[PDB]
């Protein structure tokens, strides 16, 4: 019996981003 | 008995994103 | 038992999206 | 007894978009 | 006894769009 | 033994010059 | 024994020069 | 014995210059 | 014995030079 | 014996030069 919400939401990877 | 909502959303990968 | 939802929405790859 | 709803909505995978 | 939904929507490849 | 198998494993992988 | 299986595994693992 | 697994083992793993 | 798991184990990990 | 684990473990390591 659960009835849960169980949101993850963001899981971003921003790898490298070398902005100049 | 689960009756659950499990959102995952967002997966993103914004790998070497060399933005100039 | 489930009845969820279960929603993995996004997952995108920007792989290398070299923007000049 | 599942009675899911399992939506994996995008799977995009934007490789090398090299925007200019 | 699944009864489900099982939507995988969008999969796509924008490879190599080298938009100008 | 049953499934619903959503799988992919992609690569994107190779000598990547910018 | 059941599943609803999401997997993925990518890679984006190579020599990646800027 | 069930499941609703939404696994990713992802790498993203290589020689990465900048 | 029931799951609902949202693993993912990542990895990012190489000779990344700046 | 029920579960609504929601793990990750990431690693993030190697010889990261700056």
Same mark, same amino acid.
């Given at each position: 019996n659960? $009835? *849960?919400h169980s949101?993850?939401?963001f899981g971003?990877? $921003?790898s490298s981003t070398? *902005?100049?």
């Open positions: 659960f $009835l *849960v949101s993850n939401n971003p990877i $921003l070398n *902005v100049g």
